[PDB]
């Protein structure tokens, strides 16, 4: 039939838009830890009310190559532009060589796509039913896109490679903040995979995920911090799933090893060939010193 689905973002969730911000349209405050996206239109018309557009253009055009002199905050400071005006020209901000933006809609609010949500749901169905003609039932399960996501739930996070020794990935990804509530609407054209069937499919997927992989990252400081803080021993009762990108590639052991070698050989071969002769994605905050793995969120139906 037709139902409304509520999503409780347990952790940072990202849906990559393919737009990678360069060294432009931000201010990175080392000293207060907020990055300020800038409205292009308003900023440039400011530049013209201050007739410095040729200066700004040349500053962009041949960067000083001095890393301390290769941002936008320094460009604005060199013209002594007032911080309140520097506050006048901020389109939006979040708490950085590159930054990855989510998809945005015709009014530049983030929404959750229909591709991602059935992406996770299909993955759950395929694993539980062992691909029982699940490609055919794809057409008989329909998910509406999300309602908009207002900014105040948007914040930037670094990619954390959570292994027995933690490592940072050099770039960041913007994410939805913790505990945001997001709704979409659900329609069923194949009654066989009922609402409870779908929920139990997701739950079984999660339990299998736990007893295969989530138990292995133990004895890592960030590991047991998140594993315990998220309450996954109880979460085995909860309907939890990873959405979008940034979740682990996995989302017997020997076959997993061979497959993972093959996939990483196909993926990262152009940069680090070491995969031929041989790791969790999460986020670590400075504010609370608490690590969250990217992707999981709670789903309940109605």
């Amino acid at each position: 039939k037709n139902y409304e689905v509520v999503i409780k973002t347990l952790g940072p969730i990202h849906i990559g838009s393919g737009q990678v911000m360069k060294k432009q349209d931000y201010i990175y405050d080392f000293y207060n830890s907020k990055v300020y996206m800038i409205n292009g239109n308003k900023l440039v018309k400011f530049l013209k009310r201050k007739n410095l557009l040729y200066t700004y253009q040349n500053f962009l055009r041949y960067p000083p190559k001095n890393p301390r002199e290769n941002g936008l905050k320094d460009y604005l400071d060199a013209q002594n532009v007032k911080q309140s005006e520097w506050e006048a020209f901020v389109s939006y901000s979040e708490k950085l060589n590159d930054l990855h933006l989510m998809v945005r809609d015709g009014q530049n609010k983030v929404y959750l796509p229909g591709s991602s949500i059935k992406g996770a749901i299909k993955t759950t169905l395929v694993s539980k039913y062992n691909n029982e003609k699940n490609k055919d039932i794809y057409s008989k399960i329909k998910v509406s896109d999300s309602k908009p996501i207002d900014e105040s739930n948007l914040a930037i996070y670094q990619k954390i490679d959570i292994n027995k020794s933690e490592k940072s990935m050099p770039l960041y990804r913007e994410c939805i903040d913790v505990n945001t509530e997001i709704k979409f609407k659900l329609t069923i054209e194949d009654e066989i995979y009922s609402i409870n069937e779908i929920e139990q499919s997701i739950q079984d997927f999660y339990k299998n995920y736990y007893d295969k992989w989530l138990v292995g990252f133990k004895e890592t400081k960030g590991g047991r911090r998140f594993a315990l803080e998220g309450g996954i021993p109880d979460v085995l009762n909860q309907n939890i799933l990873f959405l979008g990108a940034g979740t682990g590639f996995v989302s017997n052991r020997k076959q997993a090893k061979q497959d993972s070698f093959e996939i990483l050989t196909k993926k990262f071969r152009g940069t680090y060939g070491k995969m031929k002769e041989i790791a969790l994605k999460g986020t670590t905050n400075q504010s609370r010193h608490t690590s969250y793995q990217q992707g999981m969120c709670k789903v309940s139906f109605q």
Partner: protein, 199 residues
């Protein structure tokens, strides 16, 4: 003999792709270079959804014979019986205030979506593109009803009411399964234009 016009405005809520011209374009008027909702698509969603909401036998599906209510309300003349359409649906276009509102605010009419593909056992990323009609735009339609029998007008209007009811809760165009097409209706106006009918 009389005709009762039905006039109103449809609002798109999620993404919209009709893509009749199909790297993957959308239906558009060449006289305005602007997207449209062709009446054929609306007619098709109507016929399918209403037949499903009524009796849809496997034998009837095989023989393309449709239910008598649906058939009189939309016309078949395929079984050797005379059945002319009693309801005609037209094209639909942008309204003026939508044009203005997008002109002022620096908003486009199209959103191009990358759909990332991750392949099983290989996870090979080949991006794909699809075009969409911006949400928040509203289209203006006219439905023209032909009156042939003075009593069953009310029943046909009621069936059109469930028509719109279903269509609001379903998907129009392409990508209906994946989250594209959810539209709503507002400002419906009924006005007999020819004849002496009280509607």
């Amino acid at each position: 003999y009389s005709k009762i016009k039905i006039s109103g405005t449809i609002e798109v809520v999620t993404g919209l792709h009709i893509g009749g011209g199909g790297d993957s374009p959308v239906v558009r008027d060449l006289q305005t270079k602007l997207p449209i909702i062709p009446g054929s698509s609306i007619k098709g969603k109507m016929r399918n959804l209403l037949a499903k909401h009524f009796g849809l036998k496997m034998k009837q599906e095989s023989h393309n014979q449709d239910d008598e209510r649906v058939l009189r309300l939309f016309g078949s003349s395929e079984k050797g019986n005379i059945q002319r359409a009693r309801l005609q649906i037209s094209d639909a276009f942008f309204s003026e205030k939508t044009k203005e509102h997008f002109a002022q605010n620096d908003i486009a009419y199209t959103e191009t979506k990358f759909e990332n593909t991750i392949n099983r056992l290989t996870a090979v990323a080949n991006p794909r593109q699809i075009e969409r009609v911006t949400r928040g735009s509203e289209f203006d339609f006219v439905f023209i009803y032909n009156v042939d029998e003075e009593s069953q007008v009310e029943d046909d209007f009621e069936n059109i009411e469930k028509a719109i009811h279903l269509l609001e809760n379903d998907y129009l165009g392409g990508g209906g399964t994946r989250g594209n097409g959810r539209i709503q209706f507002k400002d419906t106006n009924i006005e007999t234009v020819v004849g002496e009918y009280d509607s």
